[PDB]
């Protein structure tokens, strides 16, 4: 269990809810196929969004049993995992499948380092295994070369643009077509596929899709949404969507912290009994719910401030909270030295905001736009307060105490660390200290603005990068009250450009012959950007893999020249994958809009591949723009199964309709306003919980063990609309008078 999960469970305990996973009955050896049209015990669900990376990644190269066969085993595992998730959630309106693709230049800074660290770990473990076999062979035993050559799955090879992504995308389409054809309950379900060709990080695609579904006047505000992902920030990102009917599904990491991890050798000691018990135990994986509707009430009861010149708005209150949480920690910028734990600093930042809010005469952020003087005052107050936090952290570290090593020599607890911290990154020169401080201030402000725009109003630069490795220390951004931030739109990177900007190590061989020849040659124009020994590992507090790299950045112009030089001699078949592509929408044979789609597109009109159809959410759902498919799909045809050894029956094209889906362009800026006609959920909170969250509780102090206990006693929480009227009865009369009479 992560520290963030523990923090959110301690501060907000009721957000943890139990799940109801159906177990199909087994009679006479056979397995009863579970129904899909039956009512879901976990409440009605309409929209489900799934990050396909979060399923294809754990299935491949797992920590218990690596797939012994070829990619086929991983494909079967991800197919059964997706089937289990679909049966658990049971979407009724639209099911969304998205996998990571092209990402903006800011993401390469940390993704490249993570991939290189993983590759180095794989290389060193392979060397250790080779040494183990060499020592074992000295005794006299003989091991087949197949076992020795049976290396890992090369997790670094899973990158957008590789043929593995294309093979996975081809398999996914067949799987969803088979599911739509063979399941009568999928008649109204609509499935979209966002392959690795489509740019996005997996979650930003979901944000764009939900803002495009909210880009229609007739969109129902009462629709429920579910997003499944293992990322910790996923539960936090869904709050920014301003959708009360939201809940996050994820695996129960509380049990998985100390789950079954015994060695395979012990599985044969007791023969049938122990193996049967083990296979029964791991067959069921508990999950949990991360409802956001309840969390909105907790945030409302925790962000209240008495006395304010402006008007307290719940929608605007969450904006400052999400901006501050992103500032404290995100996967786009280096961690602030002051905010390292990222858990205990949240309350300090919140009370700083509470004490500075009366001084300010305006809100923190306005629809993603950061108020420059207000944020300047906030960071000035934090820097004034950061001294006490730094002193307490140093005292705690000293009490606890009682690969380059850089932070140890800094000795931040001693007075005068302002230049001592910067000496670990640059030379000992006075004016250079000020120059680097100003540059870091400008870069950090630009990065904060860029991440706010990306997570609120979508991508705005697509090429911005962070040209630094160490975040500025406390009392930063002293004078910056004159800069104006205005980002420029840039074209997304090509799949090959993004793949080489990820910069896999020499172990990776997903590149074609030309690119690997241009790399492996000792006299390479970009050989300086590709280390071999990788000695850039550096601790900087923390431990284990949490250390960051210090390798030099990559110049975009050199990589562009390299790709433009390698392009002309590449084969046309391989170059055919350079197309950005568009998401593909799949609908059932008996869909409400199926007749209209079959009469408009792929019909007797026989237009020259330029007719598009725009439809609203009044009929069926999934508002958007559909276009002619660019693949080989055609009416009265057949689709070849790519799984091969999967015993999957072939299907015809008359059962599944395939077309290219394009999101509706945003007319105006995506504001944060609750849509009219939204029906609030049932009132579940009590004033006691409001007081509990208003008073500062030191993790409940373990006075009565209220943190952990009858967790299952919280039961399920009702979801969906509750009551025709969207306004709670306050004073008034008639209906409110009758309610008061029946209550009192």
């Amino acid at each position: 269990v992560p520290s963030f999960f523990r923090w959110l469970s301690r501060k907000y305990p009721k957000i943890i809810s139990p799940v109801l996973e159906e177990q199909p009955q087994i009679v006479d050896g056979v397995i009863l196929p579970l129904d899909y049209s039956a009512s879901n015990p976990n409440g009605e669900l309409d929209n489900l969004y799934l990050d396909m990376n979060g399923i294809v990644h754990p299935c491949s190269h797992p920590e218990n049993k690596p797939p012994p066969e070829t990619e086929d085993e991983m494909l079967l595992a991800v197919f059964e995992y997706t089937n289990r998730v679909l049966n658990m959630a049971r979407p009724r309106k639209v099911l969304v499948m998205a996998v990571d693709g092209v990402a903006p230049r800011a993401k390469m800074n940390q993704q490249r380092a993570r991939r290189f660290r993983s590759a180095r770990d794989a290389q060193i473990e392979n060397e250790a295994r080779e040494e183990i076999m060499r020592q074992r062979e000295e005794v006299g035993e003989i091991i087949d070369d197949a076992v020795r050559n049976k290396k890992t799955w090369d997790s670094n090879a899973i990158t957008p643009g590789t043929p593995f992504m294309d093979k996975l995308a081809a398999a996914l389409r067949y799987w969803t077509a088979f599911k739509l054809a063979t399941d009568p309950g999928w008649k109204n379900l609509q499935v979209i596929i966002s392959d690795a060709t489509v740019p996005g990080e997996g979650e930003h695609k979901i944000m764009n899709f939900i803002r495009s579904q909210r880009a229609d006047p007739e969109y129902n505000p009462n629709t429920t949404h579910c997003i499944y992902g293992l990322d910790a920030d996923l539960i936090f990102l869904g709050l920014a969507t301003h959708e009360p009917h939201f809940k996050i599904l994820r695996e129960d990491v509380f049990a998985q912290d100390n789950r079954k991890r015994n060695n395979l050798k012990d599985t044969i000691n007791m023969t049938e009994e122990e193996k049967q018990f083990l296979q029964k135990q791991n067959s069921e994986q508990p999950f949990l719910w991360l409802h956001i509707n309840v969390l909105r009430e907790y945030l409302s009861a925790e962000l209240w401030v008495p006395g304010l010149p402006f008007t307290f708005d719940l929608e605007r209150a969450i904006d400052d909270w999400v901006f501050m949480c992103f500032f404290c920690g995100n996967d786009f910028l280096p961690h602030l030295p002051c905010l390292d734990v990222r858990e205990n600093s949240i309350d300090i930042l919140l009370d700083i905001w509470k004490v500075v809010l009366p001084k300010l005469k305006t809100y923190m952020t306005c629809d993603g736009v950061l108020n420059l003087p207000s944020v300047e005052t906030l960071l000035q107050h934090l820097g004034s307060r950061e001294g006490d936090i730094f002193k307490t952290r140093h005292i705690q570290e000293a009490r606890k105490k009682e690969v380059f090593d850089t932070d140890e020599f800094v000795k931040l607890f001693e007075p005068g660390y302002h230049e001592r911290y910067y000496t670990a990154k640059f030379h000992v020169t006075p004016q250079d200290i000020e120059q680097l401080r100003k540059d870091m201030v400008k870069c950090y402000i630009e990065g904060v603005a860029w991440v706010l725009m990306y997570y609120y109003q979508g991508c705005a630069s697509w090429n911005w990068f962070y040209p630094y490795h160490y975040a500025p220390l406390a009392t930063d951004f002293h004078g910056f009250s004159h800069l104006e931030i205005k980002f420029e739109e840039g074209t997304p990177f090509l799949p090959y450009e993004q793949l080489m900007s990820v910069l896999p190590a020499a172990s990776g061989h997903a590149l074609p012959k030309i690119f690997r020849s241009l790399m492996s040659e000792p006299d390479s124009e970009i050989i300086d950007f590709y280390p071999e020994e990788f000695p850039i590992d550096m601790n900087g507090k923390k431990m284990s893999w949490q250390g960051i790299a210090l390798l030099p950045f990559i110049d975009q112009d050199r990589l562009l020249t390299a790709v433009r030089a390698q392009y002309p001699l590449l084969s046309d078949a391989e170059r055919a994958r350079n197309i950005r592509g568009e998401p593909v929408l799949l609908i059932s044979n008996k869909n409400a809009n199926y007749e209209r789609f079959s009469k408009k597109l792929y019909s007797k009109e026989n237009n020259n591949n330029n007719v598009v159809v725009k439809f609203q959410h009044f009929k069926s759902g999934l508002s958007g723009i559909v276009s002619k498919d660019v693949e080989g799909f055609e009416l009265n045809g057949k689709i070849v199964c790519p799984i091969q050894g999967g015993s999957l029956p072939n299907l015809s094209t008359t059962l599944i309709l395939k077309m290219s889906y394009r999101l509706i362009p945003l007319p105006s800026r995506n504001k944060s306003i609750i849509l009219n006609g939204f029906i609030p959920s049932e009132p579940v909170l009590t004033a006691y919980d409001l007081d509990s969250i208003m008073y500062k509780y030191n993790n409940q102090n373990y006075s009565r063990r209220w943190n952990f206990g009858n967790d299952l006693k919280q039961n399920i929480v009702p979801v969906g609309p509750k009551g025709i009227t969207q306004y709670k009865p306050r004073t008034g009369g008639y209906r409110a008078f009758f309610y008061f009479a029946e209550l009192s």
């Binding site: 196929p33 063979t182 029956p649």
Partner: protein, 171 residues
């Protein structure tokens, strides 16, 4: 095949409804509870007849709390999947596993080793169906199914059917 029985259900009425209309309260409770219940011992309680006839007895007040338990005596139509008989049903789903034949409020499943070897799965036609010589079953078709399943009555009942031997087809 449906049976008319004389079942009994115990309802623990709360003292908050100990008024002149507690009888009608028990009546509506019995309706809202017994209907749609998939009891393992009996099956489905489709409907309760003679609503204005069912009688209640003196409710015994429990020693623990003031709630009173009433032993009602109702009669209703009960459907049980049973075992060892032929029955007619209508398909509602089809897949490689089998066809989901529906008889009344039931969904009897047929596995691979149940039907004879004269059925092969294919998706060439508009409905995904098992097609072979002189056998035509589809999403909506007539089929006679013989039940030989173990039911497995655990808070709900099920059924497994067979297609072996003649007369178990469309006809």
């Amino acid at each position: 095949m449906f049976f008319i029985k004389d079942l009994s259900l115990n309802i623990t009425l709360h003292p908050s409804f100990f008024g002149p209309r507690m009888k009608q309260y028990l009546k509506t409770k019995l309706l809202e509870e017994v209907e749609g219940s998939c009891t393992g011992k009996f099956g489905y309680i489709l409907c309760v007849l003679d609503y204005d006839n069912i009688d209640i007895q003196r409710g015994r007040i429990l020693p623990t709390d003031g709630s009173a338990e009433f032993n009602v005596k109702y009669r209703a139509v009960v459907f049980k999947p049973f075992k060892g008989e032929v029955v007619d049903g209508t398909v509602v789903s089809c897949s490689q596993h089998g066809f989901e034949v529906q008889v009344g409020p039931m969904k009897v499943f047929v596995t691979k080793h149940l039907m004879p070897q004269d059925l092969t799965f294919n998706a060439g036609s508009n409905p995904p169906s098992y097609q072979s010589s002189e056998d035509v079953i589809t999403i909506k078709s007539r089929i006679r199914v013989k039940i030989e399943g173990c039911i497995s009555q655990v808070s709900s009942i099920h059924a497994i059917g067979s297609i072996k031997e003649d007369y178990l087809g469309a006809i």
